[PDB]
Amino acid sequence: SAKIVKPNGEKPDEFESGISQALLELEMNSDLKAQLRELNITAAKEIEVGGGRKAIIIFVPVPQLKSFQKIQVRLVRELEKKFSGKHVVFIAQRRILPKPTRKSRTKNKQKRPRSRTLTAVHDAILEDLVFPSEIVGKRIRVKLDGSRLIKVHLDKAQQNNVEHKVETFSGVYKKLTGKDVNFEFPEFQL
Amino acid sequence: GRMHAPGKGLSQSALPYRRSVPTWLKLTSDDVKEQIYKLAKKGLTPSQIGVILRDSHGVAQVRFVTGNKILRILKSKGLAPDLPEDLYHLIKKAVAVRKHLERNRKDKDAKFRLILIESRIHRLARYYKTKRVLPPNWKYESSTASALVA
Amino acid sequence: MPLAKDLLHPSPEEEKRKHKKKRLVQSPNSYFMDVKCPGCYKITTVFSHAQTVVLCVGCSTVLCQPTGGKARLTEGCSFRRKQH
Amino acid sequence: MQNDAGEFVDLYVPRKCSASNRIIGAKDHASIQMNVAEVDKVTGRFNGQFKTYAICGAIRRMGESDDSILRLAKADGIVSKNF
Amino acid sequence: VRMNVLADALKSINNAEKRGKRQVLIRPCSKVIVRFLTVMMKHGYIGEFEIIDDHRAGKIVVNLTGRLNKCGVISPRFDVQLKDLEKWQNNLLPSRQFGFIVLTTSAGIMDHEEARRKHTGGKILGFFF
RNA sequence: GCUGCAGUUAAAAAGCUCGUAGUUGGAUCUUGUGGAGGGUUCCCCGCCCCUUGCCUCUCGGCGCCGGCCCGAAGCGUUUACUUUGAAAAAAU
């Protein structure tokens, strides 16, 4: 059925029912009818970016996301064509569990998997945004005031698929995690 | 440095930063598992499976195509051996030197190198016994050693 | 080395000269290549430091011989690296 | 050095090496002060204006003063950030 | 073998400062090293620094300003109580007017002057002046 | 000589190697905006994901026109460390 987004009580919102309508109606034409199958989108949002414009974030459940990425190169190109001059990103619906030692209830009967840690979730969210391109390496600069900046290196092939979206990647990752990031290309790579 | 020699050489592998599978690789996770299961029926140890796959097929690191290390892939199907493969190789080397010393009792270098092999067996067995890989009653014996590898 | 050379930006000719474990970030010198032979022409993949005596899908007696460094090809039509 | 009334109490304040940020002592007879002429931008001619540097004796005797004077002259406008 | 990583980091900085070098490379990195460097930087003894990811514990490059006379480690991490801290700063510091002992406490890693304001004891890590 | 000594030539490193007890042991698993005291961001409240981490009873007072709320209790994986209470003759 339509309005697939969010748990009970949260569901009726105009923007998020609008984006999920715009996704689920697209299986009705013969090309994407071969490869969409009413697969779950868990949420969507429309958010501001540094140029005073707007961008959208689409949230995908983990066991479905390995199938979305295989068609995303056409599926996002169709959505970015249909919406009013917007930029789009797909990201995983990851959960974080709290620290067992003196910051949560804890017992021997179940152990917190390291795949549910805050560090393993925040550094996985960084790989979803850039998807048409691959991370070549990271560096972190500590300033004299005690703040941090992250420098990300992107592969030199596939520049044409991400150079016009680095300005939305910084604003989206800032709003998902609270941290400043710059996206850059290497001098050379082995 | 090496544990029983004065040498301190540096040779080893160096993995790349990029953990991803490359776009040119035609293989897929469950077909790599079937090739591992076929190679195990020939009696190949895990260390030999990884070189046959690296040399003659596209898979540089099986752990990057399939999310598991290849001894776990064998244990989950019941294909794994009853003695760990590095402990097996040390025991096979100890019986080869013992077959030499029965007729060559003047070879005092061979007598010295046998102490350095069997003390390296004792150090490795003591590790595996604490992690429940071996029974608490497991013991290497110079008379029994030939029956552990035949 | 002078008193003031910066350590964060080695030139690629400074980085390609040094040992694989002693670079700023580690990387192998080995590579994958695709290889082809006369008489039967099904293309195959080989690793440049192979230990195995490789036999092709074309069933020829030897595709390459192992060696103390790089393996040597039997005068095959390609030594072309794969890009990634 | 100042006291709780805010007045100064040193005999003198000693100079520091331009390359290295360490104090040059009263008996460091291997140390130097260098002085270099500025030129006008229309005709390349001396206008009487100049720039100065001071170098530690320990950096001179290890052979590092030539590269230190060059880095200082590239940090100021004189060598113009190309070579 | 390498029994302690913080002792390598400070000995490596201390040898580079005495040769007059403008940068130094520290390897392996650690959570303890990044928190110790931050205390020297906040008091003005070193410049800013950058961390390299390599998937094996990481590395740090540090910028040097020529102000540092020494930095060092006390190897057994002895416990200290507020009544006994006077004896340690009488032993390790060059004057009552400058230099700092660094402590680890349940309120965090910090300067021995901050531990008196926060009314807390801890374990000794090292010092700088 | 713990703080704090020494062992090429002044006194002094087992001829050499293995090895049980003893001492020592690599990296990794939750943060910035808002208010008070104070500053021009950080220490106390409440928050992106959890703020005593959970929970729902029943013997037992509170808030109001039965029902729903907020102080005990089960207790937060076990210890060292540190800070605070209590309790320890007088004379010196």
* Method used to obtain the model: cryo-EM
Structure tokens given for E10: 């400070």
Amino acid at the residue E105:
T
* E strand map for E53-121: 59-63, 71-73, 79-80, 100-105, 108-111
| Sole residue written with tokens 């229309």 | D42
d(C-alpha B54, C-alpha C51), whole Å? 10
d(C-alpha A133, C-alpha C53), whole Å? 37
Q: Phi and psi for B65 in degrees, rounded to 5? A: -85, -50
Q: Phi and psi for D8 in degrees, rounded to 5? A: -85, 145
| Length A182 CA → F40 C1' (Å) | 28
The protein footprint on chain F, as nucleotides within 7 A of a CB, is 3-4, 18-20, 24-32, 41-43, 48-50, 53-54, 76-77, 81-84
Torsion from C-alpha of B77, B81, B87, B89, nearest 10 degrees: -120
Residues 6+ apart with CB under 8 A from A76: A88, A90
Residues C23 and C67 sit within 8 Å (Cβ to Cβ): no
The domain ranges of chain C are 1-84
d(C-alpha E125, C-alpha E128), whole Å? 11
d(C-alpha A25, C-alpha A32), whole Å? 10
Interchain contact, A142 vs E52, CB within 8 Å: no
Structure tokens given for E96: 């009552």
Considering the segment(s) B81-149 as one domain, its CATH architecture is Orthogonal Bundle (1.10)
The three-class DSSP label of residue B133 is coil
C-alpha gyration radius of chain A? 19
The three-class DSSP label of residue B135 is coil
Count CA within 13 A, CB hemisphere, residue E82: 8
**Cα angle at E110 between E109 and E116, to 5 degrees?**
130
DSSP state of E7: H
* Domain E1-68, classified CATH 3.30.1370.30, yes or no: yes
Shortest CA–C1' contact from E34: which nucleotide? F27
Instruction: For chain C, give the longest Cα–Cα distance.
Output: 62
User: By residue range, what is the domain housing residue A106?
Assistant: 4-189
Angle between helices A14-24 and A72-82 (to 10 degrees): 130
Residue A137 bridge partners (DSSP): A153
Structure tokens given for D61: 């005797």
Shortest CA–C1' contact from A104: which nucleotide? F53
List own/partner pairs for B73-78 with CB under 8 A and 24 or more apart.
Answer: B73/B33, B73/B36, B74/B36, B74/B40, B74/B46, B77/B37
Residues of chain E with C-beta less than 8 angstroms from the C-beta of A144:
41, 47-48
From the list C46, C51, C80, C76, the residue with the least C-alpha distance to C61 is C76
**Third-level CATH fold of E69-129:** Dna Ligase; domain 1 (3.30.1490)
C-alpha gyration radius of chain B? 19
**Cα angle at A78 between A72 and A79, to 5 degrees?**
85
The secondary structure of chain C, three-state, reads CCCCCCCCCCCHHHHCCCCCCCCCCCCCCCCEEEECCCCCCCCEEEECCCCCCCCCCCCCCCCEECCCCCCEECCCCCCCECCC
d(C-alpha B146, C-alpha B96), whole Å? 9
Considering the segment(s) C1-84 as one domain, its CATH architecture is Single Sheet (2.20)
Q: Phi and psi for C29 in degrees, rounded to 5? A: -90, -15
Residues C4 and E22 sit within 8 Å (Cβ to Cβ): yes
User: Is C77 annotated among the ligand-binding residues?
Assistant: no
Structure tokens given for B55: 């040399």
**Nucleic strand F under 7 Å from the C-beta of A93:** no
Interchain contact, D20 vs E65, CB within 8 Å: no
d(C-alpha A164, C-alpha A185), whole Å? 13
d(C-alpha B41, C-alpha B79), whole Å? 8
Q: Phi and psi for A77 in degrees, rounded to 5? A: -65, -35
Amino acid at the residue A51:
G
Neighbours of A124 (CB within 10 A): 13
Residues E43 and E32 sit within 8 Å (Cβ to Cβ): no
β pairing state of A135-142 and A87-92: unpaired
Give burial (CB, 10 Å; 0-12/13-18/19+) of B1.
Answer: exposed
Give burial (CB, 10 Å; 0-12/13-18/19+) of A6.
Answer: middle
Residues E22 and C3 sit within 8 Å (Cβ to Cβ): yes
Run of H or E including B62: helix B62-65
Give burial (CB, 10 Å; 0-12/13-18/19+) of C3.
Answer: middle
> Among C3, C7, C8, whose Cβ lies nearest the Cβ of E20?
C3
Looking at E25-93, list the stretches that DSSP marks H as alpha helix, in order from N- to C-terminal side. Answer: 31-43, 85-92
| Sole residue written with tokens 């996002």 | A76
Tell me the torsion sign for CA atoms D43, D48, D54, D59.
positive
d(C-alpha C61, C-alpha C55), whole Å? 7
d(C-alpha B48, C-alpha B114), whole Å? 27
What is the number of residues in chain E?
A: 129
Residues B90 and B120 sit within 8 Å (Cβ to Cβ): yes
Considering the segment(s) D1-82 as one domain, its CATH architecture is 2-Layer Sandwich (3.30)
List own/partner pairs for E119-122 with CB under 8 A and 24 or more apart.
Answer: E119/E82, E120/E82, E121/E79, E121/E80, E121/E81, E121/E82, E121/E85, E122/E79, E122/E80
Angle between helices B46-56 and B29-41 (to 10 degrees): 120
| Length A105 CA → F1 C1' (Å) | 52
The domain ranges of chain B are 26-80, 81-149
DSSP state of A90: E
**Nucleic strand F under 7 Å from the C-beta of A106:** yes
Residues C83 and C35 sit within 8 Å (Cβ to Cβ): no
Residues A78 and A32 sit within 8 Å (Cβ to Cβ): yes
